[PDB]
């Protein structure tokens, strides 16, 4: 879990700059330098401010504590003192891995303008810092400042609580959290200050703080290790709950495989193959087709062989609604299908009417009053909730553990592409796959520090997560320039950290309206299926693209290729790209088996059910508008005429059912893996 490492002492000295651009109006520059260390977030150093020189010589020197095991980046920058805010003229980030100890380095930086600096890394005889590392994330050692009381402003630069300001005068107290390696000071006022040297055993300290006019206040100070246990779990292993669930699930899979594969005997847990559903995004189109694919899997008695179930964007809408009912996979799916169809067909002129807009901004004001940022994504959560359901829907990701108690459904993995890193959400845990940093979903949204929970916030209604998962907007045709105006005008009158806040990295490791980067709209949920502990043996890949039905998979090949993860090569023949078919097999024989299901209208044209010719009365049922203009399944569109909904759903149901042979074939093969 932990690691003891000694800090070094970096002594940087700022010598001179040369060729400093002037101020406007022929005035020469009044310059100074500022040093900030990436891994010392609250702290600044600042050189004297010289006057009217384009070749200024400060020759001052400052001191830091550098933890060798963390990635330390020094941002040093020259400003012109403006008598407004000061205009920057030179900035340069410098990784101080380069700088070796004992060896004195001189550097010159440039990006005309030149700045000369001298570093010296010196050993030191402080005790080693006590880290908690993941070999890619590091939690720096903390310490805590208990302050007892017998218009007070306590300030401690470098501390999660920057400045605390209390008003009572009858037995109050305060805690500050801050790194041990910070050289800093507590400052009190009604400006006396107490130094805080780094990495020492703290003593008791009293200070009398003068009132300006009246008698004085007393304060007891102790510095200690922190009391709080790490709320964030750092690791590249599956959590206990997931592990527990795997057993719980694996048996119902063997019980369900035996009938589907008409098997000789019962299976031991260690031989049960791990099968995953892997859905891509695609708005309303992805949602309804997915319902259909699930329907097929239920009818074939195969949905009960599925251990994991992952999705992105639209797929998650299907997923979230289904997991609301804690036993959806056992009950009739045509209930939820009907729900989806009706709400999809309901016209959405209401969702942008000022009665509803009121209730959004009213929930945003209520939301703003509580500890909450106002982001566009939070509004998108409210309108999406309003389209997807008629009303507020009071369900929560934690609540979906209901659906897993007895291994009665697969484990839902909602994947989310952030500003780029992948964030996976399960009812058990949520976090960054790249950093092996995870929390349980209740705490998602809460305020954190250095891997410790600082303020617990109420777990949010799932639609706010669905917006994260299916966000379509940047940080900034004729149909939807009008609700835009309706919204903007109703909303007139109107910074957000995550649970990683504080954590650090281990060393050895024109304006737009929507998102546009292709990553957001073209990937499958592979990352979830390839997380460290999961060992997937079969993947059913559902793809909801209307062109490029193999791009998302090739992305995955690439992804796994770059991480030394076994994965079969997706090389579809020229014929396959042009007119693909309902199911494609792929297959380093330790790599998962992969059945890929394009969104294609192939044999469904003239078959009403697997193996059955289409009657001329139902011919229209097989014609599905997946190409050509006025196709109703465009990503834009979020009202599907009940007729259109059905075509796509049945196509999807069919495409899977009609591929029953290959699935069963694949499952047999997965069994003989071991």
Ligand X SMILES: *[P@@](=O)(CCCCC/C=C/C/C=C/C/C=C/CCCCC)OC
Per annotation, catalytic residue among 143, 289, 310, 313: 313
Site residues for ligand X, 275-294, by CB under 6 A, read 281-283, 286
Would you say 30 is a known binding-site residue? yes
| Interaction partner, residue 142 (Tb ion, ligand X, none; CB < 5-8 Å by kind) | none
| Interaction partner, residue 483 (Tb ion, ligand X, none; CB < 5-8 Å by kind) | ligand X
Measured between its terminal Cα atoms, the distance across the chain in Å is 33
Would you say 80 is a known binding-site residue? yes
Long-range contacts, 242-250 (Cβ 8 Å, 24+): 242/411, 242/426, 242/428, 242/429, 242/533, 245/404, 245/407, 245/411, 245/428, 246/307, 247/407, 248/404, 248/405, 248/406, 248/407, 249/307, 249/404, 249/407, 249/410, 249/411, 250/307, 250/407
| Interaction partner, residue 521 (ligand X, Tb ion, none; CB < 5-8 Å by kind) | ligand X
Site residues for ligand X, 492-551, by CB under 6 A, read 520-521
Evaluate the CA torsion angle 427, 432, 438, 444 in order and state its sign.
Answer: negative
- How many residues bind to ligand X according to rule CB under 6 A? 19
CB of 162 to Tb ion, least distance (A): 20
Distance CA 391, CA 482 (A): 22
Which of residues 106 and 512 has its CB atom nearest to ligand X in the complex? 512
Question: Which among 400, 655, 622, 671 has a CA at the least distance from the CA of 541?
Answer: 655
| Interaction partner, residue 644 (ligand X, Tb ion, none; CB < 5-8 Å by kind) | none
Q: Is residue 314 involved in binding ligand X (CB under 6 A)?
A: yes
Site residues for ligand X, 363-402, by CB under 6 A, read 383
Active site annotation includes 166: no
**165 CB-near residues (< 8 Å, 6+ apart):** 152, 153, 154
| Interaction partner, residue 87 (Tb ion, ligand X, none; CB < 5-8 Å by kind) | Tb ion
Would you say 2 is a known binding-site residue? no
Q: Is residue 445 involved in binding ligand X (CB under 6 A)?
A: no
Active site annotation includes 266: no
- Radius of gyration, CA atoms only, the chain: 30
Would you say 270 is a known binding-site residue? no
Would you say 282 is a known binding-site residue? yes
- One-letter-per-residue 3-state SS of 206-271: EEEECCCCCCCEEEEEEEECCCCCCCCEECCCCCHHHHHHHHHHHHHHHHHHHHHCCCCCCCCHHH
Q: Is residue 626 involved in binding ligand X (CB under 6 A)?
A: no
**487 CB-near residues (< 8 Å, 6+ apart):** 352, 357
Of the ranges 79-87, 222-230, 384-392, 445-453, which one interacts with Tb ion (CB under 5 A)? 79-87
- One-letter-per-residue 3-state SS of 94-108: EECCCCCECCEEEEE
Of the ranges 129-137, 158-166, 300-308, 630-638, which one interacts with ligand X (CB under 6 A)? 630-638
Which of residues 283 and 549 has its CB atom nearest to ligand X in the complex? 283
Helices 314-324 and 462-469 meet at what angle, rounded to 10? 160
CB of 276 to ligand X, least distance (A): 20
CB of 421 to Tb ion, least distance (A): 14
DSSP classification of residue 431: E
* Nearest residue to the partner ligand X, using Cβ: 313
| Interaction partner, residue 30 (Tb ion, ligand X, none; CB < 5-8 Å by kind) | Tb ion
How long a stretch of residues is the chain?
674
Which of residues 513 and 612 has its CB atom nearest to ligand X in the complex? 513
Out of 484, 532, 533, 661, which residue is the one contacting ligand X (CB under 6 A)?
A: 484
Q: Is residue 86 involved in binding Tb ion (CB under 5 A)?
A: yes
Evaluate the CA torsion angle 88, 92, 93, 96 in order and state its sign.
Answer: negative
Q: Alpha carbon of 291 to those of 141, 200, 297: distances in Å? A: 49, 60, 10
Of the ranges 429-437, 483-491, 547-555, 610-618, which one interacts with ligand X (CB under 6 A)? 483-491
CB of 34 to Tb ion, least distance (A): 11
Distance CA 477, CA 247 (A): 51
**529 CB-near residues (< 8 Å, 6+ apart):** 276, 278, 308, 310, 413, 536, 539, 592
Distance CA 134, CA 149 (A): 39
Out of 23, 209, 402, 487, which residue is the one contacting ligand X (CB under 6 A)?
A: 487
Of the ranges 295-303, 530-538, 633-641, 659-667, which one interacts with ligand X (CB under 6 A)? 633-641
Per annotation, catalytic residue among 52, 162, 208, 517: 517
Distance CA 547, CA 518 (A): 14
Q: Is residue 486 involved in binding ligand X (CB under 6 A)?
A: no
Where is the binding site for substrate, in residues? 282-283
Binding site per annotation, positions: 24, 30, 80, 82, 87, 282-283
Please list the active-site residues: 313, 517
**Site residues, Tb ion (CB under 5 A):** 30, 86-87, 517
- Residues forming the annotated binding site for Ca(2+)? 24, 30, 80, 82, 87
Residues near ligand X (CB under 6 A): 281-283, 286, 313-314, 383, 470, 472, 480, 483-484, 487-488, 520-521, 635-636, 638
């Amino acid at each position: 879990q932990g690691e003891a490492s000694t800090c070094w002492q970096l002594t940087v000295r700022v010598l001179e700059a040369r060729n400093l651009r002037w101020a406007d109006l022929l005035s020469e520059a009044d310059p100074y330098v500022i040093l900030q260390l990436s891994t010392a977030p609250g702290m600044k150093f600042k050189t004297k401010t010289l006057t009217d020189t384009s070749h200024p010589v400060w020759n001052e020197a400052f001191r830091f504590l550098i933890q060798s095991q963390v990635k330390n980046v020094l941002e040093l920058s020259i400003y012109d003192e403006d008598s407004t805010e000061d205009d920057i003229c030179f900035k340069v980030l410098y990784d101080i891995s380069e700088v070796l100890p004992g060896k004195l380095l001189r550097k010159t930086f440039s990006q005309e303008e030149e700045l000369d600096v001298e570093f010296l890394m010196e050993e030191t005889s402080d005790r080693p810092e006590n880290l908690i590392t993941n070999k890619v994330i590091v939690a720096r050692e903390l310490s805590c400042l208990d302050v007892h009381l017998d218009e007070l402003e306590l300030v401690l630069k470098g501390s999660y609580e920057d400045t605390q300001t209390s008003f009572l005068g009858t037995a109050s107290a305060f805690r500050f959290h801050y790194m041990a390696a910070l050289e800093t000071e507590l400052s009190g006022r009604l400006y006396l200050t107490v130094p805080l040297r780094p990495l020492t055993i703290g003593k008791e300290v009293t200070m009398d703080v003068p009132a300006p006019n009246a008698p004085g206040v007393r304060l007891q100070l102790k510095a200690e290790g922190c009391p709080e246990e790490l709320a964030v779990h750092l690791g590249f292993n599956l959590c206990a709950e997931e592990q527990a669930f795997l057993s719980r699930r694996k048996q119902v899979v063997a019980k369900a495989l035996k009938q589907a594969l008409q098997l000789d005997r019962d299976l031991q847990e260690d031989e049960v193959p791990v099968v995953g559903i892997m859905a891509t995004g695609g708005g309303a189109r992805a949602m309804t087709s997915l319902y259909g694919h699930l329907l097929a899997l239920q009818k074939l008695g195969l949905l009960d062989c599925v251990t994991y179930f992952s999705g992105i964007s639209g797929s998650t809408w299907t997923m979230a609604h289904l997991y609301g009912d804690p036993e959806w996979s056992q009950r009739d799916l045509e209930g939820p299908i009907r729900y989806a169809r009706e709400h999809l067909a309901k016209s959405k002129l209401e969702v942008f009417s000022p009665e509803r807009l009121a209730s959004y901004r009213r929930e945003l004001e209520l939301r703003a009053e509580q500890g909450h940022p106002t982001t566009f994504v939070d509004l998108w959560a409210l309108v999406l909730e309003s389209m997807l359901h008629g009303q507020v829907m009071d369900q929560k990701l934690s609540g979906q553990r209901a659906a897993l108690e007895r291994g009665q459904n697969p484990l839902p993995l909602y994947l989310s592409l952030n500003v780029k890193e992948w964030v996976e959400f399960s009812p058990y845990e949520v976090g960054f796959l790249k950093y092996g940093a995870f929390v349980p979903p209740e705490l998602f949204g809460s305020e954190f520090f250095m891997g410790r929970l600082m303020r617990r916030i109420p777990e949010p209604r799932i639609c706010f997560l669905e917006a994260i998962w299916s966000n379509i907007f940047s940080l900034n045709e004729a149909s939807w320039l009008q609700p835009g105006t309706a919204l903007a005008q109703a909303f007139k009158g109107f910074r957000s950290p995550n649970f990683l806040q504080g954590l650090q990295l281990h060393q050895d490791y024109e304006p737009r309206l929507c998102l546009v980067d292709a990553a957001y709209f073209i990937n499958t949920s592979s990352p979830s299926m390839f997380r460290p502990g999961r060992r997937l043996d079969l993947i059913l890949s559902f793809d909801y693209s209307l062109s490029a039905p193999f791009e998302a998979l090739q992305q995955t090949e690439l992804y796994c290729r770059a991480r030394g993860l076994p994965f079969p090569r997706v090389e579809p023949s020229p014929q396959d790209q042009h007119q693909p078919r309902e199911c494609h097999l792929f297959s380093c024989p330790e790599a998962p088996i992969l059945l890929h299901f394009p969104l294609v209208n192939a044999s469904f044209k003239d078959h009403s059910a697997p193996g059955v010719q289409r009657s001329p009365a139902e011919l229209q049922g097989g014609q599905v508008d997946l190409t050509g203009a006025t196709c109703p399944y465009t990503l834009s569109n979020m009202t599907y005429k009940e007729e259109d909904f059905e075509r796509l759903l049945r196509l999807s149901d069919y495409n899977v059912q009609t591929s029953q042979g290959a699935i069963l074939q694949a499952l047999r093969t997965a069994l003989k893996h071991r």
